[PDB]
């Protein structure tokens, strides 16, 4: 990122998860095939 | 509550608390949570029935005596005997009420009362119980199915790898043990 | 009809929606706990640096530290309680997920209001969404029994 | 002609000189009250053949800032008079305007009995009127002056029903004087119309003194616009001349994405009100809400103190011919008295009184037992 | 005297009036008969202009009782809530109702069998984690 | 080295419509985001590191 | 109040603020384990009904 997401320069950050969501899309997925097929 | 709390009701003590920012903004809203809270618990714990039942006025149930859970009318309150029990045996400090070291809180610490009366709770069991030993456990997946008790204690045992005959030919036996029992 | 339900309604992703409003709200409440004068001169150290010489200057800017150490302690000290009830929810997810989806449950009122038969997940920011399939009788008639 | 109204969303100026936009913000400083009563007081005095006589300069208390209303033309009301007494023997303040110029001055100005008028009070016929001064009748002893830019300017005003009312408010307070004013339009039809405006800080003053009064200046030479009733009780009429009080309330305003505050609510008129600055939005939820505590407030005071006549004889101890050695000090007892600490100054010219468990200057206050 | 007092009031995007609640207050005293210049809130215009119930969780000024049985909207506590509806609009202050009353049927010789299904699908969130931070 | 602000930043220039008579630009979290120009008469923007 | 002149009892009142403040925080923060643990609680007995 580059209003009050941008004011806190303080020293608090917001990390990213580790999975993004096109993996747990994945997951999910593969749970469903699994369970129908 | 902060202000009576901290300052025993003086302007200049105020002034220089405001100083300190939101430190207590934070402080009347997680005892707010707490309330919510124990609100939604005792309604997520009993509330489970979407109607009120009631017990036939006939009660024969092949030998097995439920007059000591079900509701007593002769009491003012609708309570069966161990329920009357269980209230005697807890002594409770203050409650809600309405207004010897209770009355020395006028330092801004109270207590608030509860959202369901007791009577309420009673009922609610009241009509479980009216549900579990009426129409058995089919009152669980959708509306009430009748059933004869000692079928159901029948079935009950067939669900334990017990074969049914067992009950039936050992009905009075059993009914005189459950009652012993819970005597 | 769970589509047109979810779209109609929006109060049914309360529970999601709580856990980025507090963290939000817990944030500004940091941010905004700075702007306090915490008992000294100001709340602003140049100012109080370029007011007063160093001997007392020293001596009043340790209230502000005190202030901003006690303003950071609460944060974390409920980040943690937070952490644990997410935790808790978390595993009872699991718990669901690898009984209700891997298989069929025979426990009452657990995977769903009914009889349990199916149950297929789908994914949440933040969450997870499951869709039990049940059964339910619907018609009754009362008969005469030995 | 007095009559009272009812002042809806006026009165409110910006709270520092500070930009703010598109937020919520929350200052505690002097304003005026939401829904409080304002004063109509109108002058009758025309004609030169028939007429009657006057009266209609008020005296007004000005309990700690005023907030002020009126609609002329350019000129009708012309100065304005503080002081506490207005005599020769007490100072009074000369807030006066002129053409292109400002005159502020505080002096000991003696006599002020009515100012320069022509008796004639007809400008249907003739309206040459200019220079009636008698602003003062002598100064005494006195400097001070403010000679600057005039604080009102008149406004151009074509095809008619453009009218434009004038919100002057006063702050004296920590020996300085703060004027806010600006100009509101389009006064076509209603006497004191709905909306909202803000006003704007023009300069400040160090003043000082205990002003406890206020004066009009109206200038009588040439009037117009004046009904004649009598009228009274929370009634309605026409005066031109409004004025309001003061009262150290909290409100939140609504700065805009351009900055200019748009909607201001009061924290102390209405729960609903209240529940909305508790909340700080202008939107309020179904449900219930903890928002404050009431105490009842306290009626008089009392003190109970012992009833002793005699003097304590602080005198013995400090004027004493003789004192003994440090190795044998004396102890004297003083009891059964009333102790004023107040006096042991004057007996000795020391200054170093080093007092550690008690103030000295609050001593007066406390009965000890030896 | 001293106590807590709230608000209850309806969405402001729908209405605009509101109800007073004193908590653990008997309300036989000055609450009932308040007086200007004597109270802490500036605003004492309400006073008590009649509908004046008492409850055992307090005072409710403002919110006229009616005795009937629905399902309450905005919890007061010992039992009563209250509600913006109808009896010309006002805020009333009813007692909850658990729920409909039913009676059922028993008997020693008799027995119910379903004779068709209905097969049905429900939803269940949960939340999984929380958004990071450091500092 | 400012009359009162004594800021650190590396502002640059605002596009920002100001109030005439007004100096301190402010934010939802009270930060100093304007500085008035004493020769120039010109608004700048506090910008942080 | 009394007995003090306000510039050293401004001093002497912040010794009890801060005090009473540490000793409020205390009891919320010991307050929000126990709900905690009685919502565990009353989860267990809503799945036993
Ligand atoms: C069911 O049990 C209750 C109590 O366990 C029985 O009531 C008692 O009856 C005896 C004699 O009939 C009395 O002496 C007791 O005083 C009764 N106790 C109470 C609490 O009522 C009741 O009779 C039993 N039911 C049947 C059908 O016999
Ligand atoms: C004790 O002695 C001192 C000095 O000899 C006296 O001080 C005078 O006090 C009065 C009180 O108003 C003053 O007006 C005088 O100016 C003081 N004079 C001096 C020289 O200090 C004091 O009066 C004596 N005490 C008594 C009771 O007479
Ligand atoms: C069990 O319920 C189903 C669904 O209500 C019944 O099927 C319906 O039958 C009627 C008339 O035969 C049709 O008009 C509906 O369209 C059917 N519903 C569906 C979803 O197809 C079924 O008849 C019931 N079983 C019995 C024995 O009556
Ligand atoms: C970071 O740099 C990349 C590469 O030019 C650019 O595409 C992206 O917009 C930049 N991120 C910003 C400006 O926030
Ligand atoms: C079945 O129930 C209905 C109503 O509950 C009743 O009228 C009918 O008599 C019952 N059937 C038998 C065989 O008792
Ligand atoms: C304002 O006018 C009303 C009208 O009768 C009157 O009751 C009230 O006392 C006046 N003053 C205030 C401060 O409301
Ligand atoms: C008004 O201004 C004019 C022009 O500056 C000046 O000559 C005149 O003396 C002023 N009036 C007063 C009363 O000072
Ligand atoms: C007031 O003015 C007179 C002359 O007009 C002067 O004699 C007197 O000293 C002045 N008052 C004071 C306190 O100086
Ligand atoms: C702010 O200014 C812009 C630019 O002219 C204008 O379009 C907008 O309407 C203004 N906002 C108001 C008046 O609330
Ligand atoms: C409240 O006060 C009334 C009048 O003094 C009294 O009769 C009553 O017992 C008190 N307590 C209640 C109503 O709970
Ligand atoms: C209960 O309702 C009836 C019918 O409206 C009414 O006559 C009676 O006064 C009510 N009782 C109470 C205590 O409000
Ligand atoms: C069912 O209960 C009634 C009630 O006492 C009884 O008369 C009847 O004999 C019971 N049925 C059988 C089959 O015993």
């Not at chain 4, 403010?146 to 002057?168: A, C, H, I, T």
Request: charged content about 15%; aromatic content about 12%; hydrophobic content about 35%.
């Amino acid at each position: 990122k580059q209003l009050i997401c941008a004011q806190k320069f303080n020293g608090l950050t917001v990390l990213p998860p580790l999975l993004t969501d096109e993996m747990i899309a994945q997951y999910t997925s593969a749970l469903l095939a699994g369970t129908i097929t | 509550d902060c202000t009576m709390y901290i300052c025993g009701d003086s302007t200049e003590c105020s002034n220089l608390l405001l100083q300190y920012g939101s430190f207590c903004t934070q402080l009347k809203r997680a005892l707010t949570g707490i309330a919510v809270e124990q609100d939604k618990n005792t309604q997520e714990v009993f509330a489970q029935v979407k109607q009120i039942y009631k017990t036939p006025p006939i009660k024969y149930f092949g030998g097995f005596n439920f007059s000591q859970i079900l509701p007593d009318p002769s009491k003012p309150s609708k309570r069966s005997p161990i329920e009357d029990l269980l209230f005697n045996k807890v002594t409770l400090a203050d409650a809600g009420f309405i207004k010897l070291i209770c009355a020395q809180k006028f330092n801004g610490l109270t207590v608030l009362p509860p959202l369901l009366t007791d009577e309420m709770i009673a009922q609610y069991t009241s009509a479980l119980l009216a549900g579990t030993i009426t129409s058995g456990w089919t009152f669980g997946a959708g509306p009430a199915l009748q059933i004869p008790f000692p079928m159901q204690m029948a079935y009950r045992f067939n669900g334990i790898g017990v074969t049914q005959n067992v009950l039936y030919e050992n009905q009075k036996l059993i009914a005189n043990q459950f009652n012993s029992a819970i005597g | 009809k769970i589509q047109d339900s979810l779209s109609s309604t929006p109060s049914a992703l309360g529970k999601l929606q709580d856990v980025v409003n507090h963290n939000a709200q817990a944030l500004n409440t940091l941010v905004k706990q700075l702007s306090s004068k915490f008992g000294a001169i100001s709340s602003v150290l140049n100012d109080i640096l370029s007011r007063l010489d160093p001997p007392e200057a020293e001596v009043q800017i340790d209230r502000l530290i005190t202030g901003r150490l006690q303003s950071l302690q609460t944060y974390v000290t409920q980040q943690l309680i937070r952490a644990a009830e997410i935790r808790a929810s978390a595993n009872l997810a699991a718990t669901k997920m690898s009984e209700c989806v891997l298989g069929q449950s025979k426990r009452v009122d657990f995977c769903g209001k009914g009889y349990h038969l199916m149950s297929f997940p789908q994914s949440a920011p933040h969450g997870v969404v499951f869709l039990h399939v049940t059964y339910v009788p619907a018609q009754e008639k009362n008969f005469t029994t030995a | 002609t007095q009559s009272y109204t009812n002042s809806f969303t006026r009165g409110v100026y910006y709270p520092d000189k500070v930009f703010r936009s598109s937020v919520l913000h929350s200052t505690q400083d002097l304003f005026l009250p939401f829904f409080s009563n304002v004063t109509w007081f109108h002058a009758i005095h025309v004609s030169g053949t028939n007429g009657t006589k006057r009266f209609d300069n008020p005296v007004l208390p000005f309990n700690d800032g005023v907030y002020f209303a009126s609609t002329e033309k350019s000129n009708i009301i012309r100065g304005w008079i503080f002081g506490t007494t207005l005599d020769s023997k007490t100072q009074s303040l000369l807030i006066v305007n002129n053409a292109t110029n400002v005159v502020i001055k505080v002096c000991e100005f003696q006599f002020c009995n009515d100012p320069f008028l022509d008796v004639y009070y007809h400008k249907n016929n003739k309206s040459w009127m200019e220079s009636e001064f008698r602003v003062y009748s002598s100064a005494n002893n006195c400097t001070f002056e403010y000679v600057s830019q005039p604080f009102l300017m008149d406004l151009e005003g074509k095809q008619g029903n453009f009218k434009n009312l004038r919100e002057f408010v006063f702050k004296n307070i920590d020996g300085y004087f703060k004027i806010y004013s600006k100009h509101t339009p389009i006064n076509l039809g209603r006497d004191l119309p709905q909306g909202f405006s803000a006003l704007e800080p023009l300069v400040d003053l160090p003043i000082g003194i205990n002003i406890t009064r206020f004066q009009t200046l109206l200038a009588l030479h040439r009037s117009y616009l004046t009904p004649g009733d009598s009228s009274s009780g929370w009634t309605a009429g026409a005066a031109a001349y409004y004025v309001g009080y003061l009262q150290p309330r909290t409100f939140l305003l609504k700065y805009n994405e351009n900055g200019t505050i748009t909607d201001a609510v009061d924290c102390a008129l209405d729960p609903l009100s209240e529940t909305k600055c508790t909340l700080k939005s202008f939107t309020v939820e179904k449900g219930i809400y903890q928002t404050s505590n009431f105490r009842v407030q306290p009626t008089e005071s009392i003190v109970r103190f012992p009833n002793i006549t005699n003097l304590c004889p602080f005198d013995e101890v400090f004027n004493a011919t003789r004192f003994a050695s440090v190795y044998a000090w004396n102890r004297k007892r003083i009891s059964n008295c009333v102790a004023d600490y107040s006096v042991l100054y004057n007996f000795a010219p020391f200054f170093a009184f080093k007092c550690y468990g008690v103030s000295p200057t609050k001593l007066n206050d406390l009965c000890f037992t030896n | 005297s001293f106590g807590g007092v709230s608000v209850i009031t309806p969405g402001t995007n729908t209405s605009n009036q509101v109800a007073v609640l004193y908590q653990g207050v008997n309300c036989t005293e000055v609450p009932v008969a308040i007086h200007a210049d004597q109270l802490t809130p500036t605003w004492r215009v309400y006073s008590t202009g009649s509908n004046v119930f008492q409850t055992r969780a307090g005072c409710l000024i403002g919110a006229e009782y009616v005795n009937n049985s629905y399902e309450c909207d905005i919890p007061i506590g010992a039992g009563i809530c209250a509600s913006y509806q109808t009896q010309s609009q006002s805020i009333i202050a009813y007692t909850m109702s658990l729920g409909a009353e039913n009676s059922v049927a028993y008997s020693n010789n008799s027995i119910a069998i379903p004779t068709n299904f209905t097969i049905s699908v429900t939803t269940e969130i949960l939340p999984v984690s929380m958004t990071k931070t450091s500092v | 080295n400012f009359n009162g602000l004594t800021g650190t930043g590396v502002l640059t220039e605002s596009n920002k419509k100001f109030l005439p008579f007004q100096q301190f630009g402010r934010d939802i979290a009270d930060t100093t985001d304007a500085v008035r120009d004493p020769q120039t008469l010109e608004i700048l923007d506090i910008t942080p590191c």
